């Protein structure tokens, strides 16, 4: 009983300090910048070959090779320049929700509803792609696999927890807990020592991979958070929920900086990504199109459109040369 | 394509495309169905020709040169709003209700009015006729349905339960196909085949523009 009141006064103190630190909004301080105008992107490539809905996609570190999983049980690796299928990996379970591409390009992990994170080896001496490891230990559907290195991978599940694995041993090295709902998405910081996870309790909290501690937590969303992406310099992140709003939280200030809501937007955000500079906040909605938000004034600086069904995944290359979108109509489109 | 290695890469890509097309052609013969219902309702014991293969459970029995894949979503124990859209393309929903045991009506209401399955027809199975008929004599159908007024006979009670299960439809472009099953029944495959072919006929009718 006393612990409940202690928690209540702790939350009150945290909120009071958080409000005390706030002096001016981002939209007020940066009001003097020239608008970026209208950013028109044209479809340069259209990657076909998938025969079912696409849930995930990841870009190679070299910004030329892709990876995508769909309901057909196929894991296809594309050549984003000449539109060629380098590999075609058949999954054991057709229910897959999260691709991941290794930073070194050697491995590609691909897990989903079947509760395990299958890891595939691309550079084999036999010339084929083999499942190097199959990581088990989660009691719920998997989401947003991310590679730290060639032998370290972070996973998120519907078990209201995130886990850090060791591919060599295959055991759950560290487990992060504290969420009260299904954890839907995570993104790894460029410094590669912290990561943030967006759960179904309308809250995203920052984690530490080394200590396994919840350093920070962020609130403000009215519904389940569906995607998260870090700011390029590793000091902010943008979240997307079914509330049809995007928000920009800052790790140093511990508060949301601005909101990216438009009156004409009804459906929520499925995927969130930034640009290389950190000025365009691209977000995918359920109304079949993506809106490019100028991340400093919250004005729609163009619309991608072009897709027939819901956009399920976004991807911005490391050099920023392209933006690739995947949707449920089994078509990937590359924009520039 | 000018180089030799790029020509070989293009040939490899074309071979992969051909393999993908063949696999997709071979992946259209099957029929994807979804199993649902309360626990201990016989949702895993419909057809004796089971041939299965924590997570998702697949059953791939075949009939009349047609492959039926039953995805039993049981055991997930998570929020259905986040993965139920993975089954948007299922041909039908097989709902199993045990008459010998309100929760089932709640699931049925939730699954029938879901935004993903507004046009997906439902095949409703009422299991354990003998158990229900033996239990109704011992206890009248009034403890769970206090609004009942009709006769306590088996036929009228079963029809009343069927009526309350169909009353939650509340949607056009959807049909509920009903069937009464016992433990010692073998023709469930035939009933599923008729329901699936009827659903396919209706979908083709809608696509062709006839209605």
């Amino acid at each position, epitope marked *: 009983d006393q612990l409940r009141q202690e928690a209540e006064q702790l939350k009150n103190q945290i909120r009071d300090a958080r409000k005390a630190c706030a002096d001016a909004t981002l939209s007020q301080i940066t009001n003097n910048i020239d608008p970026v105008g209208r950013i028109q992107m044209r479809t340069r490539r259209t990657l076909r070959g998938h025969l079912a809905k696409i849930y995930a996609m990841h870009w190679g570190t070299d910004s*030329r*090779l892709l990876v995508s999983a769909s309901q057909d049980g196929k894991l296809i690796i594309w*050549d984003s320049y000449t539109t*060629n299928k*380098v*590999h075609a990996i058949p999954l054991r379970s057709s229910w897959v929700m999260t691709c991941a591409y290794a930073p070194s*390009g050697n491995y590609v992990a691909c897990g989903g509803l079947d509760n395990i994170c299958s890891i595939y080896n691309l*550079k084999t*001496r*036999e*010339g*084929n792609v083999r499942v190097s490891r199959e990581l088990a230990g989660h009691t719920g559907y998997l989401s947003c696999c991310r590679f730290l290195d060639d032998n370290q991978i972070v996973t998120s599940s519907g078990d209201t927890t995130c886990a850090l694995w060791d591919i060599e041993t295959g055991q759950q090295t560290t487990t992060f807990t504290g969420h009260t709902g299904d954890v839907m998405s995570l993104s790894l910081a460029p410094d590669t020592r912290l990561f943030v996870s967006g759960a179904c309790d309308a809250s995203a909290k920052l984690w530490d991979v080394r200590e396994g501690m919840c350093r920070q937590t962020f609130t403000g969303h009215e519904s389940d958070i569906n995607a998260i992406c870090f700011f390029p310099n590793g000091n902010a992140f943008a979240t997307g929920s079914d509330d049809a709003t995007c928000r920009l939280f800052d790790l140093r200030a511990d508060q949301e900086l601005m909101t990216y809501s438009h009156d004409n937007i009804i459906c929520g955000i499925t995927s969130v990504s930034f640009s290389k500079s950190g000025r365009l906040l691209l977000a995918g909605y359920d109304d079949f199109n993506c809106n490019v938000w100028d991340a400093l004034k919250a004005d729609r600086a163009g619309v991608l459109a072009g897709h027939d069904n819901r956009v399920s995944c976004l991807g911005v290359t490391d050099d920023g040369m392209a933006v690739a979108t995947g949707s449920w109509d089994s078509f990937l489109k590359i924009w520039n | 394509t*000018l*180089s*030799a*290695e*790029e*020509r*070989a*890469a293009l*040939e*490899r890509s074309k*071979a992969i495309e051909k393999n993908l097309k063949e696999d997709g052609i071979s992946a259209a013969k099957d029929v994807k169905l979804l199993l649902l219902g309360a626990d201990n309702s016989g949702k895993s014991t419909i057809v004796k020709q089971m041939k299965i293969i924590t997570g998702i459970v697949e059953t791939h029995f075949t009939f009349k040169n047609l492959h039926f894949r039953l995805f039993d979503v049981g055991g997930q124990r998570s929020e259905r709003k986040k993965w139920i859209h993975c089954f948007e393309d299922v041909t039908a929903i097989i709902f199993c209700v045990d008459l010998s045991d309100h929760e089932s009506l709640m699931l049925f209401d939730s699954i029938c009015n879901n935004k993903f399955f507004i046009d997906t027809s439902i095949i409703l199975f009422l299991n354990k006729k003998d158990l229900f008929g033996e239990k109704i004599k011992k206890s009248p159908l009034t403890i769970c349905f206090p609004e009942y007024t009709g006769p306590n006979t088996y036929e009228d009670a079963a029809a009343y339960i069927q009526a309350q299960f169909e009353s939650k439809n509340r949607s056009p472009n959807k049909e509920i196909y009903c069937h009464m099953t016992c433990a010692t029944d073998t023709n469930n495959a035939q009933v599923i085949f008729d329901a699936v072919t009827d659903i396919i006929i209706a979908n083709n009718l809608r696509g062709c523009g006839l209605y």
Partner: single-chain antibody
């Protein structure tokens, strides 16, 4: 273990027909384009034939065009080579080489053990400046070979391959485009080049590194090898 072993060699009379079988075991045979490379006695390597994956595209050398026949048996994991008429110039040690082509692959990594065949009695020209170089261990060595055309394609990839043949063994790939190190070779190797002049350097040479170094172009068929530079100790 990847292993290519071939049989069918021996002494044959001129005008006869002989078939060589290259049996593969240890990799996905159906996904690898396979070549045939012959090495005349103390003369050097020379390309012969190539069959793509699935027997789609097949090429032949101008010397034996219309005279040899190459066939692929994917279920049996066997590669054949049928020759109709044999002259006295066909006597050589025939090698079987696998080649997989995609973005970032190593298309000459593994070579067969070699089979010896004896017979009783426009193109891109690659030239190697020196035929024999004596050197002591621990001293860097520079090997260079030129090409007639500029192998630097429009896509930025230069198709130059450097092979190493230890005495009594089969050639092994070291660098496949300009500096892309092969799988398992020591990191002391390094390669460079610009358009038509290319150089291979070996820092801290070891005693196991002596042999004959071949540079081959893959820009356009028929593939042509260099004269061959031999390291002496």
């Amino acid at each position: 273990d990847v292993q290519l072993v071939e049989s069918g060699g021996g002494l044959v009379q001129p005008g006869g027909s002989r078939k060589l079988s290259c049996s593969a075991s240890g990799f996905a045979f159906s996904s690898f384009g396979m070549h045939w490379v012959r090495q005349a006695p103390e003369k050097g390597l020379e390309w012969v034939a190539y069959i793509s994956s699935g027997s789609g595209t097949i090429y032949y050398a101008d010397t034996v065009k219309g005279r040899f026949t190459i066939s692929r048996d994917d279920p049996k994991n066997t590669l054949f080579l049928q020759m109709t008429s044999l002259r006295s110039e066909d006597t050589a040690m025939y090698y079987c080489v696998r080649s997989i082509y995609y973005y970032g692959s190593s298309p000459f990594d593994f070579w067969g053990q070699g089979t010896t065949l004896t017979v009783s009695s426009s193109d891109i020209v690659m030239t190697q400046a020196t035929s024999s170089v004596p050197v002591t261990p621990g001293e860097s060595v520079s090997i260079s070979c030129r090409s007639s055309k500029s192998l630097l394609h429009s896509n930025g990839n230069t198709y130059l391959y450097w092979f190493l043949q230890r005495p009594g063994q089969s050639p092994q790939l070291l660098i496949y485009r300009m500096s892309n190190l092969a799988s398992g070779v020591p990191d002391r190797f390094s390669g460079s080049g610009s358009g038509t002049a290319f150089t291979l350097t070996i820092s801290r040479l070891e005693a196991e590194d002596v042999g004959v170094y071949y540079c081959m172009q893959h820009l356009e068929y028929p593939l042509t090898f260099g004269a061959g530079t031999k390291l002496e100790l």
